[PDB]
């Protein structure tokens, strides 16, 4: 489709930032929510559930954790929180607060301890969800942030937008339709505006071992402003959670006991 083709062309012409702004602008012509509701999707033995927040990339969703759920079999059951609006018909959230509310609702209405997990921008959604859960009285035992680049610490990702955008078209596992592409615009604006709050929750940073592009020093790595443990897995920003899902599972096991 036209949006998908424009996204591709945005990547090769160095104009992703302004195309993301166009997608955000379009997304303001879909309907939004701020009594809407959603449901987790079950993906096994274990005492503490690993709950996964879908990413916010155009190809994102529950399916992107299939390989880590499999690698976590025998360690923890795995449930997945979808990001509302990536499926046709779903409204978009008016804010980070609006999506954490309905997501927090669905976790509390179906749990029994748990940790919350997310990849890339998914990590930021996961930490917002855990923030909202700790505020409501049902706090997870911790958060696992997989290649998180919080706002203000994304110089590497911005300098690699062409590499990442072409890599997303290689690994297009669900096809980026219009509903997905505008949702990408709308969530990208929300997470850009959002700022994590200190919570005191135990935090595990799972960083990639390999950069997605050239860089002069180590400062390309994920970062987190509050106290946390850090572990590295083989792979780049994309492969760390797919072809190397087992390396992450083992670190999650160790961190859980």
């Amino acid at each position: 489709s036209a949006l998908r083709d424009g996204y591709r062309q945005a990547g090769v012409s160095g104009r992703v930032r302004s195309y993301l702004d166009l997608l955000a602008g379009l997304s303001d012509f879909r309907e939004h929510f701020d009594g809407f509701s959603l449901d987790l999707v079950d993906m096994g033995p274990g005492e503490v559930t690993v709950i996964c927040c879908a990413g916010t990339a155009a190809i994102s969703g529950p399916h992107e954790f299939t390989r880590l759920a499999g690698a976590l079999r025998g360690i923890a059951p795995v449930r997945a929180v979808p990001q509302p609006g990536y499926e046709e018909g779903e409204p978009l959230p008016s804010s980070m607060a609006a999506v954490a509310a309905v997501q927090a609702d669905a976790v509390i209405r179906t749990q029994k301890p748990f940790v919350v997990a997310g990849h890339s921008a998914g990590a930021l959604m996961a930490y917002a969800l855990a923030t909202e859960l700790l505020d409501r009285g049902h706090p997870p035992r911790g958060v696992v942030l997989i290649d998180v680049y919080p706002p203000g610490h994304q110089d590497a990702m911005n300098a690699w937008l062409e590499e990442l955008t072409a890599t997303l078209f290689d690994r297009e596992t669900v096809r980026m339709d219009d509903t997905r592409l505008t949702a990408l615009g709308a969530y990208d604006r929300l997470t850009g505006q959002w700022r994590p709050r200190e919570t005191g929750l135990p935090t595990l940073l799972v960083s990639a071992g390999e950069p997605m592009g050239p860089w002069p020093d180590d400062s390309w790595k994920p970062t987190w402003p509050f106290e946390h443990d850090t572990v590295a897995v083989p792979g780049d920003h994309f492969t760390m959670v797919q072809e190397h899902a087992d390396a992450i599972a083992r670190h999650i096991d160790a961190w859980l006991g």
Partner: antibody, heavy 119, light 114 residues
Framework: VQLQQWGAGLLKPSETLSLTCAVY????????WSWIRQPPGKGLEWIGE???????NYNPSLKSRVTISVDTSKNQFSLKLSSVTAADTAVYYC??????????????WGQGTLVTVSS | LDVVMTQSPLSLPVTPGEPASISCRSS???????????LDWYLQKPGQSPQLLIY???NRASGVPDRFSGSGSGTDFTLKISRVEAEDVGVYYC?????????FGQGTKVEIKR
């Protein structure tokens, strides 16, 4: 979309070179911004670069004397080079994102200010 | 230690409408884990600032006519013009972007044999 360059063209040895580049047409926040120099008759030497947050990459041969600054408020970035000698005589250019991806629509380099060092 | 870029030939006279090729060889590989090569080509026409022609080894900047094209990977790279025209007189530089500092080849001057 366009870069304008100004600054003093003659300075005595041991003094401090000072140049400024202004970026017209936005897109300031997505790229590192470079300074390059070209002594008369010779090739190109990369000096260093800065982004909007003020993060800085320098050429080790010049790191001791070079300072690159940014003023996001005016979309301007500046070059200062201290304790200057005759080997710093050159044409100095400003540019966007040298060597990074994303450069299909790269702006033209600044037109370059010649800087001569002499008493 | 800095990449050293060697350009060949340093001087290249071509009769117009003939093709021409410039080679450059780096002292370390410009190939990156992710597959891309970070090699740029610039043209400095007489009296002007360098301008980008080829970026990421093989991609043409906007406004660059299709007679220009680049090729190569890892340690050697070439720039080729198919039908050399009068407008193409100037000095061609390659520059590597995989390492810091960025470093340039010596430059090769193209003269039109008229």
């Amino acid at each position: 979309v366009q870069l304008q360059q100004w600054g003093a063209g003659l300075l005595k040895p041991s003094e401090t070179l000072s140049l400024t580049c202004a970026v017209y047409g936005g897109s300031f926040s997505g790229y590192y911004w470079s300074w390059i120099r070209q002594p008369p008759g010779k090739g190109l030497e990369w000096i260093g670069e800065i982004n909007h947050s003020g993060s800085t990459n320098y050429n080790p041969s010049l790191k001791s004397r070079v300072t690159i600054s940014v003023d996001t408020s005016k979309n301007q970035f500046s070059l200062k080079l201290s304790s200057v000698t005759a080997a710093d005589t050159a044409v100095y250019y400003c540019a966007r994102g040298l060597g990074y991806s994303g450069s299909y629509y790269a702006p033209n380099w600044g037109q370059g200010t010649l800087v001569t060092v002499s008493s | 230690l800095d990449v050293v870029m060697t350009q060949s030939p340093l001087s290249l006279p071509v009769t117009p409408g003939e093709p021409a090729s410039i080679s450059c060889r780096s002292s370390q590989s410009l190939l990156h884990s992710n597959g891309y090569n970070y090699l740029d080509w610039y043209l400095q026409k007489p009296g002007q600032s360098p301008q980008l022609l080829i970026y990421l080894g093989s991609n043409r900047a906007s406004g660059v006519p299709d007679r220009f094209s680049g090729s190569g990977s890892g340690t050697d790279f070439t720039l080729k013009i198919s039908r050399v025209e009068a407008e193409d007189v100037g000095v061609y530089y390659c520059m590597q972007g995989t390492h810091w500092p960025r470093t340039f080849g010596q430059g090769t001057k193209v003269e039109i044999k008229r």
